[PDB]
Design an enzyme around this catalytic site. Structure first.
Site, short mmCIF file in Angstrom:
data_model
loop_
_atom_site.label_atom_id
_atom_site.label_comp_id
_atom_site.label_asym_id
_atom_site.label_seq_id
_atom_site.Cartn_x
_atom_site.Cartn_y
_atom_site.Cartn_z
N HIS A 79 0.85 -1.34 0.01
CA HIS A 79 -0.08 0.02 0.20
C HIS A 79 0.87 1.09 -0.16
O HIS A 79 0.62 2.08 -0.76
CB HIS A 79 -1.07 -0.24 1.09
CG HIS A 79 -2.25 -0.80 0.88
ND1 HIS A 79 -3.59 -0.17 0.87
CD2 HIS A 79 -2.39 -1.87 0.76
CE1 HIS A 79 -4.44 -0.83 0.73
NE2 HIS A 79 -3.76 -2.03 0.65
N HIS A 242 -0.90 -12.33 -3.08
CA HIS A 242 -2.09 -13.16 -2.50
C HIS A 242 -1.68 -14.44 -2.54
O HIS A 242 -2.57 -15.33 -1.77
CB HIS A 242 -3.21 -12.94 -3.60
CG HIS A 242 -3.73 -11.58 -3.74
ND1 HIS A 242 -4.68 -11.37 -4.83
CD2 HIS A 242 -3.50 -10.65 -2.88
CE1 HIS A 242 -4.92 -9.90 -4.65
NE2 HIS A 242 -4.57 -9.59 -3.35
C1 HEM Z 1 -5.36 -5.59 -9.07
C2 HEM Z 1 -4.76 -5.34 -7.70
C3 HEM Z 1 -5.22 -5.83 -6.15
C4 HEM Z 1 -6.27 -6.11 -5.72
C5 HEM Z 1 -7.75 -5.47 -6.50
C6 HEM Z 1 -6.09 -6.53 -4.57
C7 HEM Z 1 -6.92 -6.49 -3.54
C8 HEM Z 1 -7.09 -7.15 -2.05
C9 HEM Z 1 -8.22 -6.80 -1.16
C10 HEM Z 1 -9.54 -6.54 -1.31
C11 HEM Z 1 -7.78 -7.35 0.07
C12 HEM Z 1 -8.09 -7.84 1.19
C13 HEM Z 1 -7.83 -6.62 2.55
C14 HEM Z 1 -8.14 -7.11 3.69
O1 HEM Z 1 -7.40 -8.00 4.40
O2 HEM Z 1 -9.44 -7.17 4.23
C15 HEM Z 1 -6.23 -7.75 0.09
C16 HEM Z 1 -5.16 -8.09 0.64
C17 HEM Z 1 -3.80 -8.53 0.79
N1 HEM Z 1 -3.03 -8.34 -0.36
FE1 HEM Z 1 -4.25 -7.37 -2.36
N2 HEM Z 1 -4.79 -6.65 -4.12
C18 HEM Z 1 -4.04 -6.07 -5.06
C19 HEM Z 1 -2.81 -6.41 -5.12
C20 HEM Z 1 -1.79 -6.93 -4.46
C21 HEM Z 1 -0.22 -6.92 -4.68
C22 HEM Z 1 0.64 -6.30 -5.98
C23 HEM Z 1 0.27 -7.37 -3.54
C24 HEM Z 1 1.80 -7.24 -3.00
C25 HEM Z 1 2.61 -7.71 -3.94
C26 HEM Z 1 -0.86 -7.68 -2.49
C27 HEM Z 1 -1.06 -8.07 -1.47
C28 HEM Z 1 -1.89 -8.40 -0.25
C29 HEM Z 1 -1.46 -9.35 0.92
C30 HEM Z 1 -0.24 -9.94 1.52
C31 HEM Z 1 -2.75 -9.46 1.38
C32 HEM Z 1 -3.24 -9.96 2.68
C33 HEM Z 1 -3.09 -9.23 3.95
C34 HEM Z 1 -3.53 -9.88 5.18
O3 HEM Z 1 -3.90 -11.00 5.17
O4 HEM Z 1 -3.70 -9.23 6.05
N3 HEM Z 1 -1.99 -7.11 -3.15
N4 HEM Z 1 -5.94 -7.46 -1.38
O1 SHA Z 2 -7.75 -2.40 -2.63
C1 SHA Z 2 -7.43 -2.76 -1.51
N1 SHA Z 2 -6.47 -3.23 -1.25
O2 SHA Z 2 -5.11 -3.32 -2.31
C2 SHA Z 2 -8.65 -2.74 -0.64
C3 SHA Z 2 -8.50 -3.13 0.65
C4 SHA Z 2 -9.48 -2.96 1.62
C5 SHA Z 2 -10.84 -2.55 1.46
C6 SHA Z 2 -11.15 -2.07 0.18
C7 SHA Z 2 -9.84 -2.20 -0.87
O3 SHA Z 2 -10.22 -1.81 -2.18
#
Ligand code: HEM
Ligand code: SHA
Ligand code: HEM
Ligand code: SHA
Lengths: 703, 710
Positions: A79, A242
């Site tokens: 982020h 992810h």
């Molecule tokens: C098209 C782009 C992306 C979308 C729509 C997306 C979105 C999301 C959403 C909605 C969540 C959940 C937030 C939550 O825990 O409630 C999450 C988390 C997570 N994201 Fe993404 N993401 C993107 C990309 C990325 C990239 C590029 C990385 C890092 C190289 C990343 C890494 C992470 C990690 C490690 C978690 C899980 C965190 C946790 O368990 O606490 N994300 N993402």
């Molecule tokens: O885009 C996000 N994280 O990358 C995201 C995380 C939590 C809630 C809404 C969102 O759009």
């Protein structure tokens, strides 16, 4: 009580406050603070060991999912660097500005206030030896490493900021988690690397909340492209990220979430949001271990849409073997089923992404290599050239996106040679105007946001800059050719190992021309010159990436691209902020340049003087003369004419760039100073200091 | 696409930007620019000569009414100084911020943009030797003098600002000419010198647009009082000012008025209000909405206004636009005045509700009557009031510059007596310093006294400060926040030390109670730092004198009485604004940056200088020691805060009993920017840094009112 300044009354008001931020470094740290030398005193390995311990040190006030904070910190790091846009180089981990509003209160940053808080003890332990900015990225790296993936490398050097970056337009949305910047999947408002305000890249449920994977992919591609990432980097980043953690949402957050940090009660001491976005569930069977779980779950099984109890869209696996195949984040005696977001399915539904993901599954090593490289780029893309990368974990390999510079394999010129070169340059057939325009074209691409551009490297002579319309290619070639002849002439006549680069000559030539313009006005000025710039080659230049530095409006040259959106003067201020200029420096610069006459196509726009190439304050004197009346030019949407009251006598032509200095209240106060009978020398000195400042912006050497 | 900040999302956010303004001085002028030094070179009479010439030099783009710009310049000067409020001392012509938005766009300042533009040639000729602020006031003076009235004098010294003051919350109403600050004429909101935002004092047609002279008078008295003017002064200024010129508006008061300066087309170059009756078109000129002069000789000083007001009857009337004005009931004035542009035409004198108020109101009537029977008294009170009006925020006499400064020092200037003795030397400052630490006074006592003394200073109108030692005089010696009984004890001891020193000199050396107060504070801070293991030498500048009650207008100093004092953790339980908002406002009056304020509060808490010796925010075990304990404990995640303006800090585990504080202390761990500073000072390697920053801030506050040596 909150005052309603002239920024809340009229929208069409310039935001000069962004330039005021350049006139002072807010914060308690000494104004001459040298973070680099402080970071060098840091025992990096000790910080990493403390972070490693922290990873599995679940706190009661915020228990760790699966007993490991790793995933949370990776999201945090992503982020922090995720806001980056190539359009202006703004956003990015650089100054750790995520800690301030409004960024710290965006819906997509929910609970990142907790992640940062967990790092407070470590930050306090090491103090000024490590910035918040560096520490956040370092936490991300340690999380990934602790979970089985060795990173590509790490460099410190990100100095902490103490205020938000006011010069950042995040979108036309007055609301968060809502958008009004695109109609079709793949056509968002130019510049911004996000399709939705408050969001980082795209809507997790899909375009406009619709579970359309194919349409989502187009937005993903476009937005990641505006964040400097291609298909392979994008797929590797999403899949890589992810592979860890999960999404949080036990119901509907729109009705189960508290006040954001900035709106929370004082007793919450900076923490807020006390279910983040309806969707719930992990992507893989082992959320805290690096493996091929994400790619396998996505490609090996069929998925279909599903509205959760919160009404939010997510995807479930048709299979039944994955059912309850994942342990619960906090309840041991419980299980959970892997889920996917519409943005994950997009990687499988899009033909190009699918091909990349298939190759990744086929060659697990290629997935690792791409994620490693992409993660390193994402988190260091805004740090500038290699010279700024500090610490023992800096990779030996320099990446092309760092816009590398070669070593000067020769002795540097001294005072004697500097004067000699200066004399020969002015004695050539190059005019003061040619010299100033060329030096300006070389140095003006610099942006303090991501530290790209600048005169060092003399990339002005290479693609794509040598052929940019604004640089007038045909005319530019003449000046560069002549300076190159001088370089050859100087180097071949040296008796020792001394040599001069073309980069230095271009700047030296500009300095000589300014000095000459001042001499023509009766002033003797000596501009400080620092040699050492080198000439970069095409093999070390990513031509396409430099397109981001191409200007749409250039005040010094009074250049305005035919199809721009916002008023010319707004872009001018935005551009001035990238050069770290204050309002007065911007004014002195434009005003003085007009007396010299450095206009694109050599027009007389804003050139309110009868003695070209003579540095004076004529621009201000004539601009402020009420004996002249200004009017828009008939059948011309860019030009204005100064007519001398109503006598009709057409004297002077100008653009909005020139006239803003007599229209905007604050700029007019500065112009009235420079246009006074006792300010000519003051203007000359301020113009030279600003010119010198701009010429040395990419010289991080002396710091 | 205007990049919104945070106020649009979180309106109740802290306006720290007002403190960032003290971190730098925007503008082209050099860092070490000394305007006083530059004005001193100016040939004042030569400037007055050019202005006098300008008065009758009509400019095509904005012709002078009756062929004389005099009236316009008086209004301009009146408007430049008329925004002054005694509450915070802000407003006033001091910085010439009238030239910047949002002020330059107030409906009230219509066409004053033209007036300023007329002075541009003169400004360019003299350059930095005279600021816009000084020039605008001088133009008013010359106008008055050129029309037959002699002034009390003039003083330069108003340095120009290059940006608006983000501190003045001009009005709660999010719209011009509208108000939510008063339901009944005479009970306007507290902290405003105007009855309606966008206005200077009151509504010209009367409260809420109702032509009620009686109610109007109530608002006039209240607003002027908040601007430091009494009945006599108020009546003199209004009558004196409306003795010249006329009102502008023969059409709709809200139709022809083109876009305000800030909204005008770029080609207009800062000049707005594209009125269909003001720039160039021989005939009827328009600005406000009412039309017609007050007297028959708009460009001459005489008893016309008062005579025309009291000798005839007036009745309300909805002119051309719905704007209220008062016309004579007698034909003796019909077509008695020459037109502002066409002398072949005749015009009838008019009056505003605010003018009638001076007649309808009993107190004001007695004044106007006395004026008519004693012209000399009218012109005399007008001169005095005009002088005070235009010099009110200039500070002590020392700041009044130029050859036209009246030899008479006014009481409202917070005069200071000259030192009739030799200044103490470096050796005596040492002996006196030690003697102070050898008394029965603690570090807390010395720090609190020095703070109560220097903390009254406000950069807005340059009033207050440690010089003069007015802390020992009324009304400060009895302010609740200063703890009278306790303060007296400290003053008693220092005075005795003063008595012994002076009576032991074998020459003409003497020390003032004012210098000892500050010296005592320096010694206490030095001791607190020493108690922490640090060796510091706070700079000391002797020279402060002791002002007597004759140099002090007690009632006027009540404006300097704080409602909230962060350093002493004092909060008046009856304020409307959040404590932290007031804290930032006050910090700005001390020219502090966010970092200086944070260091100051943190340091003071480690020393323990709270009002009533409370333990609020005193997060330390070693009182009277200068450390970073405040920040270390403030950032302690092991504590859970909850309401008691007091809060209770609880340890996460179990129930128990722990810290207590106020919003003043907690904001430093809640606000994003302040927390970032707090994290720096609360780090393992920043104790010495905090000590040094605290000392530098303490030294700065102690010498804020030292212009005597500039
Ligand atoms: C098209 C782009 C992306 C979308 C729509 C997306 C979105 C999301 C959403 C909605 C969540 C959940 C937030 C939550 O825990 O409630 C999450 C988390 C997570 N994201 Fe993404 N993401 C993107 C990309 C990325 C990239 C590029 C990385 C890092 C190289 C990343 C890494 C992470 C990690 C490690 C978690 C899980 C965190 C946790 O368990 O606490 N994300 N993402
Ligand atoms: O885009 C996000 N994280 O990358 C995201 C995380 C939590 C809630 C809404 C969102 O759009
Ligand atoms: C109760 C307070 C007052 C009210 C409501 C008020 C009123 C008004 C109005 C409505 C106008 C006409 C603006 C225009 O169309 O041109 C005007 C102007 C004028 N005012 Fe006042 N005023 C007050 C007081 C004062 C004071 C205190 C002075 C200065 C000693 C002053 C000075 C002048 C002068 C000289 C003019 C005429 C300008 C001209 O011809 O161009 N006013 N006022
Ligand atoms: O004072 C004024 N003009 O000089 C004035 C003008 C318009 C509205 C209110 C006012 O107080």
């Amino acid at each position: 009580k909150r005052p309603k300044s002239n920024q809340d009354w009229w929208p069409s008001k310039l935001n000069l406050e962004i330039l005021d931020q350049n006139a002072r470094d807010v914060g308690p740290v000494e104004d001459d603070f040298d973070y680099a030398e402080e970071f060098q005193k840091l025992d990096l390995e000790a910080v990493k060991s403390d972070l490693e311990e922290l990873m599995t040190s679940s706190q009661d006030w915020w228990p760790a999912d699966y007993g490991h904070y790793g995933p949370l910190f990776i999201r945090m790091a992503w982020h922090s660097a995720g806001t980056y846009r190539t359009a202006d180089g703004r956003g990015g981990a650089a100054g750790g500005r995520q800690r301030f509003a409004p960024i710290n209160s965006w819906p997509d940053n929910a609970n990142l206030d907790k992640a940062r808080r967990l790092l407070l003890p470590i930050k306090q332990k090491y103090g000024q030896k490590i910035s918040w900015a560096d520490l956040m990225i370092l936490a991300g790296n340690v999380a990934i490493e602790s979970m089985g993936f060795k990173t590509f490398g790490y460099a410190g050097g990100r100095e902490d900021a103490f205020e938000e970056d006011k010069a950042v337009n995040w979108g036309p949305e007055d609301e968060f988690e809502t958008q009004e910047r695109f109609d079709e999947p793949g056509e968002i408002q130019e510049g911004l690397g996000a399709s939705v305000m408050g969001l980082i890249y795209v809507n997790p449920e899909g375009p406009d909340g619709n579970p359309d994977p194919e349409a989502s992919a187009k937005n993903i591609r476009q937005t990641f492209d505006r964040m400097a990432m291609n298909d392979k980097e994008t797929a590797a980043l999403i899949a890589g990220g992810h592979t860890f953690g999960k999404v949080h949402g036990a119901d509907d957050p729109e009705e189960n979430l508290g006040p954001e940090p900035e709106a929370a009660p004082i007793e919450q001491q900076g923490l807020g949001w006390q279910i983040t976005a309806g969707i719930e569930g992990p992507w893989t069977q082992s959320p805290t271990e690096w493996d091929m779980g994400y790619i396998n779950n996505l490609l090996d099984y069929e998925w279909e849409p599903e509205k959760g109890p919160g009404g939010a869209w997510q995807w479930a696996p048709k299979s039944e073997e994955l059912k309850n195949s994942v342990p619960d984040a906090h309840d041991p005696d419980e299980k959970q089923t892997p889920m996917m977001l519409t943005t994950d399915i997009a990687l499988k539904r899009d033909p190009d992404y699918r091909e990349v993901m298939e190759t990744f599954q086929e060659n697990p090593m290629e997935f690792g290599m791409n994620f490693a490289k992409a993660w390193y780029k994402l988190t260091h893309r805004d740090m500038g050239p290699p010279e700024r990368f500090l610490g023992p974990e800096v990779p030996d390999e320099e990446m092309i996106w760092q816009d590398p510079l070669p070593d000067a394999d020769y002795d540097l010129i001294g005072d004697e040679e500097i004067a000699e070169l200066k004399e020969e340059i002015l004695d050539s057939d190059l005019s003061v105007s040619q010299l100033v325009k060329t030096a300006w074209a070389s140095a003006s691409t610099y942006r303090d946001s991501d530290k790209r551009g600048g005169a060092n490297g003399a990339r002005l002579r290479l693609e794509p800059q040598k052929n940019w319309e604004v640089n007038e290619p045909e005319q530019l070639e003449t000046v560069l050719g002549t300076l190159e002849n001088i370089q050859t002439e100087f180097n071949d006549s040296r008796s020792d190992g001394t040599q001069v680069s073309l980069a230095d000559l271009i700047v030296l030539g500009g300095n000589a021309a300014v000095e000459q313009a001042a001499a023509n006005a009766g002033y003797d000025v000596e501009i400080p010159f620092e040699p050492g710039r080198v000439d970069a080659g095409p093999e070390h230049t990513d031509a396409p990436s430099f397109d981001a530095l191409k200007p749409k409006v250039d005040g010094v040259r009074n250049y305005i691209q035919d199809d721009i959106t916002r008023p010319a003067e707004e872009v001018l201020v935005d551009n001035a902020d990238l050069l770290n200029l204050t309002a007065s420096e911007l004014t002195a610069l434009i005003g003085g340049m007009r007396s010299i006459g450095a206009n694109y196509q050599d027009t007389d726009l804003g050139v309110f003087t009868d003695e070209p190439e003579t540095l004076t304050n004529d621009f201000f004197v004539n601009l402020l003369d009420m004996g002249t009346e200004w009017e828009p030019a008939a059948d011309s949407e860019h030009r204005y004419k100064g007519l001398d009251r109503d006598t009709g006598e057409v004297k002077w032509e100008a653009t909005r760039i020139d006239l803003i200095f007599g229209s905007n209240d604050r700029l007019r106060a500065i112009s009235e100073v420079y246009g006074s009978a006792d300010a000519e020398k003051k203007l000359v000195h301020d113009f030279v200091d600003t010119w010198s400042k701009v010429m040395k912006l990419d010289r991080f050497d002396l710091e």
